[PDB]
Amino acid sequence: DVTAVGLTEAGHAFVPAAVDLPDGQRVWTGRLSLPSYPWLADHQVLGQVLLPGVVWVELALHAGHQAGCDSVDELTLQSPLVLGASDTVQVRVVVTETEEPGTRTVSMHSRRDDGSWVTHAEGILGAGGPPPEPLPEWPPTGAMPLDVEGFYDELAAGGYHYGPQFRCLRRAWRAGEDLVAEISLPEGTDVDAYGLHPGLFDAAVHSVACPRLPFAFSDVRLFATGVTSLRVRIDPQNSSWQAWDESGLPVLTIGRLVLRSATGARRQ
Amino acid sequence: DVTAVGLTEAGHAFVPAAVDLPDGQRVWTGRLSLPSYPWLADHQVLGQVLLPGVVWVELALHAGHQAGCDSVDELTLQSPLVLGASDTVQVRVVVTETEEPGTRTVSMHSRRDDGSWVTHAEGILGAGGPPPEPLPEWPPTGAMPLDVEGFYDELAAGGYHYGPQFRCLRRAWRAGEDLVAEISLPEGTDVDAYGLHPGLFDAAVHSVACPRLPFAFSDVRLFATGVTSLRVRIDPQNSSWQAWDESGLPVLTIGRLVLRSATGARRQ
């Protein structure tokens, strides 16, 4: 119970404590390791366990909401975080007020014991945004069912080995020039301490493949927490995402997402 | 156990946790209240429970030692901290690296729930200092015993009501132009989680009265922890302190100390 040491319970699985500072700064803190979250081993690229980049967006959405900034105006990923089998890593989310109210900087960092701080993401938290649009029918129509059989075996062949907690893609269609998909977590996935569980958040992004890593995010908003199943619409003409729950209520919008390509401890 | 939230156990009663930050900053954090440390009610000035100013020096000595800076080059007190009967207060000690190694800034802050941050002290942590001198005989000789009967009743009459944990002065002599004193904690005082227990630290300073508050500290060094009884020598020609334990081993030096005179919640 962190209030006994003058901190605030922060209500997130990855950053359970928050440290208000006289800076106008607020810092969310946690410890990441595979024994604490074994399902993190289900995100392995080229034999390395990497923290999914969408984890840093999820943390920004959580910190920004707690700070009054319901929008991730901008988040840019930098160095990846590789989790060894033995590794334990301190994590920080640092939110800093600016000279313009309603706009705050955010940065994400980690540190291993015998090591220095590493910056994993930097960005800007903002107020509000465009309202989401409704889901008038599902699936969209004139939409052709796509064969997603062995979709994950295909990704594995290109080096992206998605484990049980990340194999969330269930059905997909081509809808005009857009991609639409049903994506859902395995049954019994605990999502209480997340805004959007990383495995479902990641499958929302990696479904664009019907094998790359997210790089830069613009205008991300989360409208609902605790969602375990999504209906997703992806538009590559400005690489944007909309997600609704099974009843069509809005869950997530990404105004723009740009991807990128491929150090680290040794495997096994 | 704060390591589970990515922090460090800091080993001090008032600041049990430390937050390393990528700033090069390190922050010690705690919660202060009279139910957690009821002996803090034993330091009451003009009816107000004030945190003794020497608490901020003790915290600086603890943080500086953990950061490699064995000297409080400089600490200047600002706003006092008044503890209400009901009050709970978050405290921070913020240590920041500078452009000159071996020298770091330190600042002390508090915040009540419905309130803003308040700065209680600012200063500079440094490396090393002058070595302490030995204690060749005790008491010093040609030293005349001073009557310290009702010393605390006298202080009370001027508004300084020292309670059991702070009534540590036992014997005093005039030694030439210097003051020397034996000062010790009540039996059974737990000092495990302090460098120098605040009640004994404060009695070292307030013994100068054979009724004022500390203001500015220069060149403070703590040579030993866990001491419960002190032999003290005060020199008003540069308002300096030396303290040894009962066996003459060095405990504390204050290179220079300047005092000062007299908001707050309502008593009772």
Author numbering:
A (entry chain A), B (entry chain A): 31 to 239, 301 to 359
Quote the study that presented this structure, word for word:
The dehydratase (DH) domain within type 1 modular PKSs is responsible for the dehydration of specific C-3 hydroxyacyl-acyl carrier protein (ACP) intermediates, resulting in a corresponding enoyl-ACP. Here, we present the crystal structures of the borrelidin DH domain from module 3 (BorA DH M3) and the fluvirucin B1 DH domain from module 1 (FluA DH M1) at 1.80 Å and 2.01 Å, respectively. The DH monomers from both BorA DH M3 and FluA DH M1 possess the traditional double-hotdog fold with an invariant His/Asp catalytic dyad. Within each DH monomer, the substrate-binding cavity contains (1) a hydrophobic tunnel/phosphopantetheine (PPant)-binding region, (2) a catalytic region and (3) an acyl intermediate-binding region.
The borrelidin PKS from Streptomyces parvulus Tü4055 utilizes a rare trans-cyclopentane-1,2-dicarboxylate starter unit. The first DH domain, isolated from the third module in the borrelidin PKS, is specific towards a trans-cyclopentane-carboxylate-containing polyketide substrate. In the case of BorA DH M3, we were unable to model 11 residues between α3 and β11, suggesting a highly flexible region within the DH domain. A lack of modeled residues between α3 and β11 is also observed in the erythromycin M4, phthiocerol dimycocerosate, curacin F and the rifamycin M10 DH domains. Surprisingly, the same flexible loop region between α3 and β11, where residues are either missing (BorA DH M3) or have higher B-factors (FluA DH M1), form part of the acyl-binding region. From the catalytic Asp located in α3 to a conserved Pro in β11, the residues between them form part of the bottom of the substrate-binding cavity responsible for binding to the acyl-ACP intermediates past the C-3 hydroxyacyl position. The lack of 11 unmodeled residues in the BorA DH M3 acyl intermediate-binding region would yield inconclusive in silico docking results. Therefore, we opted not to conduct substrate docking analysis with the BorA DH M3 model. However, no electron density for the corresponding substrates was observed. The lack of substrate binding may be due to high specificity of both BorA DH M3 and FluA DH M1 for their native PPant-tethered polyketide intermediates 1, 4.
